């Protein structure tokens, strides 16, 4: 604070503007986050490992803080990710003798997990990410090969999207999912949130990641997507927005910070991109970045290990940076 205004004050009549936290985060940082949004999702200590890291034994303390930490000052909670493929203990998957787990055993097993974590925090997270990732990246193929796959059954997004609809029959269950704007994945998601929704499974939403750099997709491939799910009359949330200074599969290493091209890119990017959100704000009800500010953030770590990445409006010192007052929203 000093002169600058509200993120998330300057949409509040447009969509919750929030942020991807982790307990360590709440202290140091607690009151930035209170001041920018209204909506938090955390990156990490609520996946499967992280709350059930054996069989019988659950650990919710670090999950406890953030609800804690959100609710007393009314902020939004979104619950990410109950089935995935990636962050899940090997016991999960497996029986006595080392061998793979039955569908039953499966059923059992998922069933238990979802009832005690989406029970938990019953009437007090909004939005669920039930099931996360289940498209395939590769054009000819449309579900991606999993164990959720293979040892449950093919109808395993059903199973989820009902079992968590019982634990708390009033939050928003969404289907999340990266490069939801690619021509080819977009309609593979398209296909399956409109499979889902006949085979009469409660999914509400379409979770759109929103891992993009300041390359693509292009406003038009974005809008076309919103558009494509919006007409599956479901709401929108972007859920794991960042804004990359490098593409995928870039080989440049060695930045210390961003090249000035990188920058002018980026804050006219973005602007475009809030720009876009607002003109169909009756769409899209929720904006999460996945991070606070520059000085910390996944990309740093992938896909290239220690390579330090600024993909926020929110510099490595949590100052505003010029794409931030191109964002400020009508209200
Ligand atoms: O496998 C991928 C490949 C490319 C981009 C994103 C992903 C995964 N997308 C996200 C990354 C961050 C994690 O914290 C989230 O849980 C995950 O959903």
Same mark, same amino acid.
Do not use: C
């Given at each position: 604070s000093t002169e600058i205004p509200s993120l998330s004050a300057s949409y509040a009549n447009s969509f919750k503007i929030g942020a991807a936290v982790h307990t360590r985060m709440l202290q140091t940082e607690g009151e930035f986050i209170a001041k920018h949004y209204n909506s938090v999702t955390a990156e990490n200590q609520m996946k499967f490992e992280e709350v059930?890291? !054996? #069989?019988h034994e659950y650990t919710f303390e670090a999950a406890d803080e953030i609800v804690d930490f959100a609710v007393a000052r009314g902020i939004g909670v979104r619950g990410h990710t109950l089935v995935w493929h990636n962050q899940t203990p090997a016991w999960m998957f497996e029986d006595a003798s080392g061998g793979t787990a039955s569908r039953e055993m499966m059923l059992s097993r998922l069933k238990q997990h979802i009832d005690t974590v989406v029970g938990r925090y019953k009437d007090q997270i909004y939005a669920w990410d039930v099931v996360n990732e289940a498209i395939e990246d590769k054009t000819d193929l449309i579900m991606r090969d999993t164990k959720w796959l293979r040892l449950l059954g093919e109808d395993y997004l059903v199973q989820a999207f009902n079992m968590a609809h019982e634990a708390d029959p009033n939050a928003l269950l969404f289907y999340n999912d990266y490069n939801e704007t690619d021509p080819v994945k977009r309609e593979k998601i398209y296909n399956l949130v409109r499979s889902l929704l006949d085979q009469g499974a409660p999914v509400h939403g379409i979770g759109m990641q929103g891992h993009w750099n300041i390359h693509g997709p292009s406003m038009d491939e974005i809008r076309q997507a919103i558009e494509r799910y919006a007409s599956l009359d479901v709401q929108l949330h972007v859920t794991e927005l960042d804004l990359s200074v490098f593409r995928h #599969?870039?080989? !440049?290493?060695?930045?210390?910070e961003p090249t000035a091209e990188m920058a002018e890119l980026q804050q006219k990017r973005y602007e475009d991109i809030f720009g876009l959100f607002r003109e169909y704000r009756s769409n899209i009800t929720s904006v999460t970045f996945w991070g606070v500010a520059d000085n910390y953030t996944w990309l740093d770590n992938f896909p290239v290990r220690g390579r330090k990445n600024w993909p926020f409006v929110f510099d490595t010192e949590l100052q505003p940076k010029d794409s931030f007052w191109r964002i400020i929203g009508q209200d």
């Amino acid at each position: 604070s000093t002169e600058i205004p509200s993120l998330s004050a300057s949409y509040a009549n447009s969509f919750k503007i929030g942020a991807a936290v982790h307990t360590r985060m709440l202290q140091t940082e607690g009151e930035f986050i209170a001041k920018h949004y209204n909506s938090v999702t955390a990156e990490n200590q609520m996946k499967f490992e992280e709350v059930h890291p !054996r #069989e019988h034994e659950y650990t919710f303390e670090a999950a406890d803080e953030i609800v804690d930490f959100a609710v007393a000052r009314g902020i939004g909670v979104r619950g990410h990710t109950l089935v995935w493929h990636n962050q899940t203990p090997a016991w999960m998957f497996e029986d006595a003798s080392g061998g793979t787990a039955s569908r039953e055993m499966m059923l059992s097993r998922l069933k238990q997990h979802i009832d005690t974590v989406v029970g938990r925090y019953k009437d007090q997270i909004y939005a669920w990410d039930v099931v996360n990732e289940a498209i395939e990246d590769k054009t000819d193929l449309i579900m991606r090969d999993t164990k959720w796959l293979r040892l449950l059954g093919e109808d395993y997004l059903v199973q989820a999207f009902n079992m968590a609809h019982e634990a708390d029959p009033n939050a928003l269950l969404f289907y999340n999912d990266y490069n939801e704007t690619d021509p080819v994945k977009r309609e593979k998601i398209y296909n399956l949130v409109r499979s889902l929704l006949d085979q009469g499974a409660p999914v509400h939403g379409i979770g759109m990641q929103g891992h993009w750099n300041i390359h693509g997709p292009s406003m038009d491939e974005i809008r076309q997507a919103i558009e494509r799910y919006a007409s599956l009359d479901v709401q929108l949330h972007v859920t794991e927005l960042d804004l990359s200074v490098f593409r995928h #599969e870039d080989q !440049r290493t060695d930045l210390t910070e961003p090249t000035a091209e990188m920058a002018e890119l980026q804050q006219k990017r973005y602007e475009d991109i809030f720009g876009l959100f607002r003109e169909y704000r009756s769409n899209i009800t929720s904006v999460t970045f996945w991070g606070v500010a520059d000085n910390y953030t996944w990309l740093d770590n992938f896909p290239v290990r220690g390579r330090k990445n600024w993909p926020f409006v929110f510099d490595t010192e949590l100052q505003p940076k010029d794409s931030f007052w191109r964002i400020i929203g009508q209200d």
